[PDB]
């Protein structure tokens, strides 16, 4: 995972977004949404989804939200007041901590001004705090912008490292939830929905010579009288029940 001063973003698109797979990562610590319900995630289809990941202290997890301020919110990772999406965080001590302290995770402490939403700054340029140029010499009122966390096994709650993932949820949509389905019943009389084609009647064997690109057929009155089963690709002849 990336340091908070240099958070890592990747784009998500053209996929089936199963949001149940991420509830088996770790016990449970922080989870909150915004503009979306946790139980409607496996349904809504999004135009764009972005995953922003980083490592921070447990006590800093509260800063990753709309309307927050402190250190991380202002100098490392800022969310917009109208942020839409879900934030997931869990305790990663067992993987990230070290006996003398893991010093490979950095955050920005010295900064001229607050960051904009989803802005990043990867610069390590010397910060001038005073009214005189130090020309690179780290003396008085002259600082290296970044500091380390030094995560240790001996630290209590709030000082331990947490892995944070922010899923930003945003026209034609490409990131859709999964669909459920049941068994196919033949030669009876059922209600049915075939990949969006709703209707009622008896489903029987068909001898209609469908072309490779055709999904359903119609009678002389332009009414659907046959469908292709989306899983078996078989053709079902549809008639009214006796």
């Amino acid at each position: 995972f990336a340091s908070v001063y240099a958070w890592n973003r990747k784009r998500i698109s053209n996929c089936v977004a199963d949001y149940s797979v991420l509830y088996n990562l770790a016990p449970f610590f922080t989870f909150k949404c915004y503009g979306v319900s946790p139980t409607k995630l496996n349904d809504l289809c999004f135009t764009n989804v972005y995953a922003d990941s980083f490592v921070i202290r447990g006590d800093e997890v509260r800063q990753i939200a709309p309307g927050q301020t402190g250190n991380i919110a202002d100098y490392n990772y800022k969310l917009p007041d109208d942020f839409t999406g879900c934030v997931i965080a869990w305790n990663s001590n067992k993987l990230d901590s070290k006996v003398s302290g893991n010093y490979n995770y950095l955050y920005r402490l010295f900064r001229k001004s607050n960051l904009k939403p989803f802005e990043r700054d990867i610069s390590t340029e010397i910060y001038q705090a005073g009214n005189k140029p130090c020309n690179g010499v780290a003396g008085f009122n002259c600082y290296f912008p970044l500091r380390s966390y030094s995560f240790r096994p001996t630290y209590g709650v709030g000082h331990q490292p947490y892995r944070v993932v922010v899923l930003s949820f945003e026209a034609p949509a490409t990131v859709c939830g999964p669909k459920k389905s049941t068994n196919l019943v033949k030669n009876k009389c059922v209600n049915f929905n075939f990949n969006g084609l709703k209707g009622t009647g008896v489903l029987t064997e068909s001898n209609k010579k469908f072309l490779p690109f055709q999904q359903f057929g119609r009678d002389i009155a332009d009414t659907t009288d046959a469908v292709r089963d989306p899983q078996t690709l078989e053709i079902l002849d549809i008639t009214p029940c006796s």
């Epitope: 001590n93 067992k94 993987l95 990230d96 901590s97 070290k98 006996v99 003398s100 490979n104 240790r152 096994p153 001996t154 630290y155 209590g156």
Partner: antibody, heavy 117, light 109 residues
Framework: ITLKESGPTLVKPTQTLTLTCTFS??????????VGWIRQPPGKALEYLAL???????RYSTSLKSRLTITKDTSKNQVVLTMTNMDPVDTATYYC???????????WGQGILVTVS | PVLTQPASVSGSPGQSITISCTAT?????????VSWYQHHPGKAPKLMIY???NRPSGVSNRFSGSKSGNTASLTISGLQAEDEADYYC?????????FGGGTKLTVLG
């Protein structure tokens, strides 16, 4: 998961002891996993010597920090610990073991007995 | 900054005994990563309990543990003659890891 130890069993005073741990069944280059060394002198408890992490971060016992050096070769699955300026009192059985956070050491090897004389 | 243990523990077979290990410093912090070992002479040390109370695979359910404050305890129920070994505790400190003095177990009979 197995770890085998080999090296000198007899060392002269002021000389350097080099022990090699060869492991298999796992990779060291993974998060949360390291390899360390522990020794047990006669009549005494286990003493921590050194630990090397998957990212080559090298840590040592504070009392032996200046005497121990630990390195690893990920191509042969081997970890090597060298201890300089061996004293007549540095007689112990050395052990190679896997280091994790929820469990400080596990999968301990049988160990190698080193005597200084 | 030393882990302190009793010189030995003893009791009748079939009964329960306790092996204790107490920290003497605040360098241990949360002291929530206590490991216990059963060392059989001539063999490698074996991990019996980790993270205070959890068992590794290949370990009998007769072995368990707990914590109170900055002191840890190893509980051995249904004591067997096969449990005669030197037991050790281990925990993290601010810049290193330590092992305890070691407790010698004796089974009466």
């Amino acid at each position: 998961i197995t770890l085998k130890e080999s090296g000198p069993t007899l060392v002269k005073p002021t000389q350097t002891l080099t022990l090699t741990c060869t492991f298999s069944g796992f990779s060291v280059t993974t998060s949360g996993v390291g390899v360390g060394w522990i020794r047990q002198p006669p009549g005494k408890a286990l003493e921590y010597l050194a630990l090397i992490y998957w990212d080559d971060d090298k840590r040592y016992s504070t009392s032996l920090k200046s005497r121990l050096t630990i390195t690893k070769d990920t191509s042969k699955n081997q970890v090597v610990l060298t201890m300089t300026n061996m004293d007549p009192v540095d007689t112990a059985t050395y052990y190679c073991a896997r280091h994790t956070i929820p469990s400080i050491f596990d999968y301990w090897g049988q160990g190698i007995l080193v005597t200084v004389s | 900054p030393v882990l302190t243990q009793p010189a030995s523990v003893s009791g009748s077979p079939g009964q329960s005994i306790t092996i204790s290990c107490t920290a003497t410093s605040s360098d241990v912090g949360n002291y929530n990563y206590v490991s216990w070992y059963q060392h059989h002479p001539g063999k490698a040390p074996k991990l019996m309990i980790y993270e205070v109370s959890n068992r590794p695979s290949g370990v009998s359910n007769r072995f368990s543990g707990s914590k109170s404050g900055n002191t840890a305890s190893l509980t051995i129920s249904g004591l067997q003659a096969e449990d005669e070994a030197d037991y050790y505790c281990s925990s993290y400190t601010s810049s290193s890891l330590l092992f305890g003095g070691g407790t010698k177990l004796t089974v009466l009979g």
